[PDB]
Amino acid sequence: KLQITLTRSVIGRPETQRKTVEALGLKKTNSSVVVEDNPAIRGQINKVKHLVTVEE
Amino acid sequence: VSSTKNGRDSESKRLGAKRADGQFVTGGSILYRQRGTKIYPGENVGRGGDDTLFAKIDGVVKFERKGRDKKQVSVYAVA
C-alpha cells in the first residue's frame, strides 16, 4: 500500500502531467489516495514525482 | 530591387507507415506509402504501381528484416 498526496498544484504544468495526476485518482491540491504498489502505479508516480509525496 | 527566386514547394504526400506491427488489418489495407521500395512486400502483401504496400489477406502486420540491409512487411492470418 502507498499513500500518494498531491502536494503541488497542477496549474502551470503540462497537460500530460495533469493527465497522470488525474489517472492516479488525485483531485484537489493536498488530496490523497491509497493504492496497491506495482510497476504501473510506480511509473505514474515517477512521471509526476515532483508534484506528489509518497508514504509507504 | 530585391526579390527571391525561391518560394516554391509541392504538397506533402503523407508517406510512411499506415498500420503498426502487431495490428490486425483487413485485406486491401495500405500498410506503407513510399517512393521506391524503402520497404519490400512480404508474405500476403502486394506492391501497387506507386510502390504502396498493401495487405492481401486479413491478418496481423509484421515488419521483418530482409537480409542484411533491407526490410519487408508481411501479413499473417490469425489462428
Binding site: - | 530585391s2 526579390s3 527571391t4 525561391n6
Partner: protein
C-alpha cells in the same frame, strides 16, 4: 585570406555555437599550440591577423599550422533595407570555435618564443585562449 575555393551552397544556416569542441582538441603537428577556452565565430580576417602576428615574432625560424579553417559563409543584408525579401549576400567566411579547439600550432622554436608568439596572436582573436604543449 582563407576561404573555400568553392561551396555547394553559398547561403547557409548559421552554425550551432553551444557545446564543446567536437574534435581537433590536441596538439598533433607541432610542439606548442593555442587552445580556445571560450566560444566564438572566427573570421578569415582574424585568422590572417593572428597568423601574421605570430609568424612575424617567430621571424621565420619555426613552423606554424593553422588548425581551423573558415568553411562557413555568412551573409549580410544591404544597408538600410526593411526585413524580408530574401536572404542577403555572402559577407565573409568563419570557423566556429568552442572550448578546447586548438587554433594554431608552432614548432621549431623555444618554448618562451612560442609563448610570446602565441600571446601576440591571441590578442587578435575574439576568444580567450591558453598556451598548451603536446600531451603525453
Amino acid at each position: 585570406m582563407l576561404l573555400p575555393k568553392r561551396v555547394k551552397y553559398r547561403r547557409q544556416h548559421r552554425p550551432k555555437t553551444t557545446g564543446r569542441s567536437k574534435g581537433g582538441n590536441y596538439v598533433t603537428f607541432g610542439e606548442f599550440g593555442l587552445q580556445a577556452t571560450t566560444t566564438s565565430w572566427i573570421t578569415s580576417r582574424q585568422i590572417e591577423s593572428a597568423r601574421i602576428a605570430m609568424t612575424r615574432y617567430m621571424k621565420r625560424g619555426g613552423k606554424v599550422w593553422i588548425k581551423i579553417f573558415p568553411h562557413t559563409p555568412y551573409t549580410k543584408k544591404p544597408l538600410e533595407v526593411r526585413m524580408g525579401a530574401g536572404k542577403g549576400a555572402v559577407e565573409g567566411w568563419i570557423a566556429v570555435v568552442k572550448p578546447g579547439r586548438i587554433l594554431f600550432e608552432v614548432a621549431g622554436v623555444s618554448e618562451e618564443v612560442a609563448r610570446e608568439a602565441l600571446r601576440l596572436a591571441s590578442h587578435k582573436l575574439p576568444v580567450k585562449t591558453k598556451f598548451v604543449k603536446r600531451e603525453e
